[PDB]
């Protein structure tokens, strides 16, 4: 991110599979996205860890299909925050912002679009 980066925009989503992990998350805290390409159920898998690096859950397969290519090619940095419901039991909401270089803005938006997503303000 050399001569800086720009906001491509934002996306809301869900951390799922909560019941299988014990990673604690507090409201309005950063979570981290971490690719799990070797995942047996899905090559696009993306784990969601708390700031300490304990697994909290996974992104839903549709969002993961959308984002995997973007993380793999470093087309954008993704910042995720759990805005509310961090103590939910099955799923938790997840706010995302996408940042990167101007010249990758279209690469990013096409990748999202072909998987059914569009960044917003």
PDB file of C-alpha atoms in Angstrom:
ATOM      1  CA  UNK A   1       0.000   0.000   0.000  1.00  0.00           C
ATOM      2  CA  UNK A   2       2.756   2.450  -1.228  1.00  0.00           C
ATOM      3  CA  UNK A   3       1.308   5.921  -2.172  1.00  0.00           C
ATOM      4  CA  UNK A   4      -1.513   5.144   0.281  1.00  0.00           C
ATOM      5  CA  UNK A   5      -4.789   3.324  -0.066  1.00  0.00           C
ATOM      6  CA  UNK A   6      -8.363   4.243  -0.621  1.00  0.00           C
ATOM      7  CA  UNK A   7     -11.647   3.029   0.821  1.00  0.00           C
ATOM      8  CA  UNK A   8     -13.370   0.747  -1.787  1.00  0.00           C
ATOM      9  CA  UNK A   9     -16.339   0.705   0.560  1.00  0.00           C
ATOM     10  CA  UNK A  10     -18.157  -1.490   3.081  1.00  0.00           C
ATOM     11  CA  UNK A  11     -19.953  -4.801   3.433  1.00  0.00           C
ATOM     12  CA  UNK A  12     -22.022  -6.396   6.206  1.00  0.00           C
ATOM     13  CA  UNK A  13     -21.956 -10.152   6.811  1.00  0.00           C
ATOM     14  CA  UNK A  14     -22.147 -12.937   9.363  1.00  0.00           C
ATOM     15  CA  UNK A  15     -19.740 -14.985  11.395  1.00  0.00           C
ATOM     16  CA  UNK A  16     -21.173 -18.477  11.545  1.00  0.00           C
ATOM     17  CA  UNK A  17     -20.414 -21.882  13.160  1.00  0.00           C
ATOM     18  CA  UNK A  18     -20.136 -20.165  16.555  1.00  0.00           C
ATOM     19  CA  UNK A  19     -21.260 -23.321  18.328  1.00  0.00           C
ATOM     20  CA  UNK A  20     -17.996 -25.075  17.332  1.00  0.00           C
ATOM     21  CA  UNK A  21     -15.517 -22.650  18.936  1.00  0.00           C
ATOM     22  CA  UNK A  22     -14.903 -20.743  22.143  1.00  0.00           C
ATOM     23  CA  UNK A  23     -13.160 -17.616  20.953  1.00  0.00           C
ATOM     24  CA  UNK A  24     -14.560 -14.694  22.872  1.00  0.00           C
ATOM     25  CA  UNK A  25     -15.463 -11.463  21.021  1.00  0.00           C
ATOM     26  CA  UNK A  26     -16.679  -8.242  22.650  1.00  0.00           C
ATOM     27  CA  UNK A  27     -18.996  -5.744  21.005  1.00  0.00           C
ATOM     28  CA  UNK A  28     -17.272  -3.212  18.738  1.00  0.00           C
ATOM     29  CA  UNK A  29     -14.055  -5.201  18.684  1.00  0.00           C
ATOM     30  CA  UNK A  30     -11.829  -6.002  15.662  1.00  0.00           C
ATOM     31  CA  UNK A  31     -11.893  -9.594  14.439  1.00  0.00           C
ATOM     32  CA  UNK A  32      -9.385 -11.014  11.973  1.00  0.00           C
ATOM     33  CA  UNK A  33     -10.079 -12.837   8.680  1.00  0.00           C
ATOM     34  CA  UNK A  34      -7.829 -15.732   7.953  1.00  0.00           C
ATOM     35  CA  UNK A  35      -7.861 -17.852   4.812  1.00  0.00           C
ATOM     36  CA  UNK A  36      -7.985 -21.588   5.265  1.00  0.00           C
ATOM     37  CA  UNK A  37      -7.315 -22.859   1.781  1.00  0.00           C
ATOM     38  CA  UNK A  38      -6.802 -26.436   2.917  1.00  0.00           C
ATOM     39  CA  UNK A  39     -10.257 -26.648   4.409  1.00  0.00           C
ATOM     40  CA  UNK A  40     -11.923 -29.949   3.468  1.00  0.00           C
ATOM     41  CA  UNK A  41     -15.494 -28.596   3.096  1.00  0.00           C
ATOM     42  CA  UNK A  42     -14.504 -25.487   1.003  1.00  0.00           C
ATOM     43  CA  UNK A  43     -11.296 -24.260  -0.657  1.00  0.00           C
ATOM     44  CA  UNK A  44     -12.484 -20.666  -0.224  1.00  0.00           C
ATOM     45  CA  UNK A  45     -12.826 -20.996   3.528  1.00  0.00           C
ATOM     46  CA  UNK A  46     -12.183 -17.965   5.714  1.00  0.00           C
ATOM     47  CA  UNK A  47     -11.818 -18.412   9.491  1.00  0.00           C
ATOM     48  CA  UNK A  48     -12.743 -15.571  11.781  1.00  0.00           C
ATOM     49  CA  UNK A  49     -10.425 -15.093  14.766  1.00  0.00           C
ATOM     50  CA  UNK A  50     -10.679 -12.753  17.748  1.00  0.00           C
ATOM     51  CA  UNK A  51      -7.800 -10.198  18.297  1.00  0.00           C
ATOM     52  CA  UNK A  52      -5.925 -12.876  20.372  1.00  0.00           C
ATOM     53  CA  UNK A  53      -6.069 -15.281  17.471  1.00  0.00           C
ATOM     54  CA  UNK A  54      -8.577 -17.782  18.835  1.00  0.00           C
ATOM     55  CA  UNK A  55     -11.024 -19.033  16.253  1.00  0.00           C
ATOM     56  CA  UNK A  56     -14.513 -17.633  16.664  1.00  0.00           C
ATOM     57  CA  UNK A  57     -16.099 -19.160  13.567  1.00  0.00           C
ATOM     58  CA  UNK A  58     -16.198 -18.961   9.749  1.00  0.00           C
ATOM     59  CA  UNK A  59     -17.601 -16.697   7.011  1.00  0.00           C
ATOM     60  CA  UNK A  60     -20.632 -18.126   5.163  1.00  0.00           C
ATOM     61  CA  UNK A  61     -19.602 -19.966   2.002  1.00  0.00           C
ATOM     62  CA  UNK A  62     -21.114 -17.351  -0.321  1.00  0.00           C
ATOM     63  CA  UNK A  63     -19.133 -14.476   1.235  1.00  0.00           C
ATOM     64  CA  UNK A  64     -16.082 -16.689   1.423  1.00  0.00           C
ATOM     65  CA  UNK A  65     -16.351 -17.416  -2.331  1.00  0.00           C
ATOM     66  CA  UNK A  66     -16.627 -13.745  -2.906  1.00  0.00           C
ATOM     67  CA  UNK A  67     -13.616 -12.803  -0.733  1.00  0.00           C
ATOM     68  CA  UNK A  68     -11.138 -15.653  -1.165  1.00  0.00           C
ATOM     69  CA  UNK A  69      -9.782 -14.411  -4.490  1.00  0.00           C
ATOM     70  CA  UNK A  70      -9.471 -10.881  -3.039  1.00  0.00           C
ATOM     71  CA  UNK A  71      -7.482 -12.065   0.015  1.00  0.00           C
ATOM     72  CA  UNK A  72      -5.408 -14.508  -2.057  1.00  0.00           C
ATOM     73  CA  UNK A  73      -4.268 -11.862  -4.500  1.00  0.00           C
ATOM     74  CA  UNK A  74      -3.968  -9.112  -1.948  1.00  0.00           C
ATOM     75  CA  UNK A  75      -6.316  -6.919  -3.962  1.00  0.00           C
ATOM     76  CA  UNK A  76      -7.613  -5.313  -0.746  1.00  0.00           C
ATOM     77  CA  UNK A  77      -7.124  -5.112   3.012  1.00  0.00           C
ATOM     78  CA  UNK A  78     -10.260  -6.109   4.833  1.00  0.00           C
ATOM     79  CA  UNK A  79     -11.029  -4.673   8.270  1.00  0.00           C
ATOM     80  CA  UNK A  80     -13.703  -6.532  10.179  1.00  0.00           C
ATOM     81  CA  UNK A  81     -15.517  -5.427  13.309  1.00  0.00           C
ATOM     82  CA  UNK A  82     -18.251  -7.117  15.253  1.00  0.00           C
ATOM     83  CA  UNK A  83     -20.598  -4.234  15.831  1.00  0.00           C
ATOM     84  CA  UNK A  84     -23.192  -5.868  18.111  1.00  0.00           C
ATOM     85  CA  UNK A  85     -24.348  -9.272  19.326  1.00  0.00           C
ATOM     86  CA  UNK A  86     -20.832 -10.525  20.127  1.00  0.00           C
ATOM     87  CA  UNK A  87     -22.442 -12.827  22.702  1.00  0.00           C
ATOM     88  CA  UNK A  88     -24.840 -14.363  20.216  1.00  0.00           C
ATOM     89  CA  UNK A  89     -24.994 -18.140  20.084  1.00  0.00           C
ATOM     90  CA  UNK A  90     -25.332 -19.199  16.468  1.00  0.00           C
ATOM     91  CA  UNK A  91     -24.151 -16.319  14.240  1.00  0.00           C
ATOM     92  CA  UNK A  92     -22.845 -12.833  14.759  1.00  0.00           C
ATOM     93  CA  UNK A  93     -23.009  -9.733  12.591  1.00  0.00           C
ATOM     94  CA  UNK A  94     -19.799  -8.607  10.966  1.00  0.00           C
ATOM     95  CA  UNK A  95     -18.969  -5.191   9.497  1.00  0.00           C
ATOM     96  CA  UNK A  96     -16.268  -5.038   6.841  1.00  0.00           C
ATOM     97  CA  UNK A  97     -14.421  -2.231   5.138  1.00  0.00           C
ATOM     98  CA  UNK A  98     -12.209  -2.795   2.050  1.00  0.00           C
ATOM     99  CA  UNK A  99      -9.156  -0.660   1.408  1.00  0.00           C
ATOM    100  CA  UNK A 100      -6.544  -0.818  -1.334  1.00  0.00           C
ATOM    101  CA  UNK A 101      -4.951   0.944  -4.262  1.00  0.00           C
ATOM    102  CA  UNK A 102      -7.041   2.928  -6.696  1.00  0.00           C
ATOM    103  CA  UNK A 103      -5.947   0.770  -9.584  1.00  0.00           C
ATOM    104  CA  UNK A 104      -7.458  -2.359  -8.022  1.00  0.00           C
ATOM    105  CA  UNK A 105     -10.897  -0.818  -7.334  1.00  0.00           C
ATOM    106  CA  UNK A 106     -12.433  -2.424 -10.443  1.00  0.00           C
ATOM    107  CA  UNK A 107     -10.747  -5.795  -9.895  1.00  0.00           C
ATOM    108  CA  UNK A 108     -12.289  -5.749  -6.404  1.00  0.00           C
ATOM    109  CA  UNK A 109     -15.753  -4.660  -7.404  1.00  0.00           C
ATOM    110  CA  UNK A 110     -15.988  -7.161 -10.332  1.00  0.00           C
ATOM    111  CA  UNK A 111     -14.881  -9.976  -8.117  1.00  0.00           C
ATOM    112  CA  UNK A 112     -17.600  -9.060  -5.626  1.00  0.00           C
ATOM    113  CA  UNK A 113     -20.170  -8.590  -8.294  1.00  0.00           C
ATOM    114  CA  UNK A 114     -19.720 -11.928  -9.958  1.00  0.00           C
ATOM    115  CA  UNK A 115     -20.389 -13.518  -6.552  1.00  0.00           C
ATOM    116  CA  UNK A 116     -23.430 -11.364  -5.839  1.00  0.00           C
ATOM    117  CA  UNK A 117     -21.988  -8.607  -3.654  1.00  0.00           C
ATOM    118  CA  UNK A 118     -21.654  -4.851  -3.930  1.00  0.00           C
ATOM    119  CA  UNK A 119     -19.764  -2.509  -1.631  1.00  0.00           C
ATOM    120  CA  UNK A 120     -21.651   0.374  -0.187  1.00  0.00           C
ATOM    121  CA  UNK A 121     -20.988   3.622   1.614  1.00  0.00           C
TER     122      UNK A 121
END
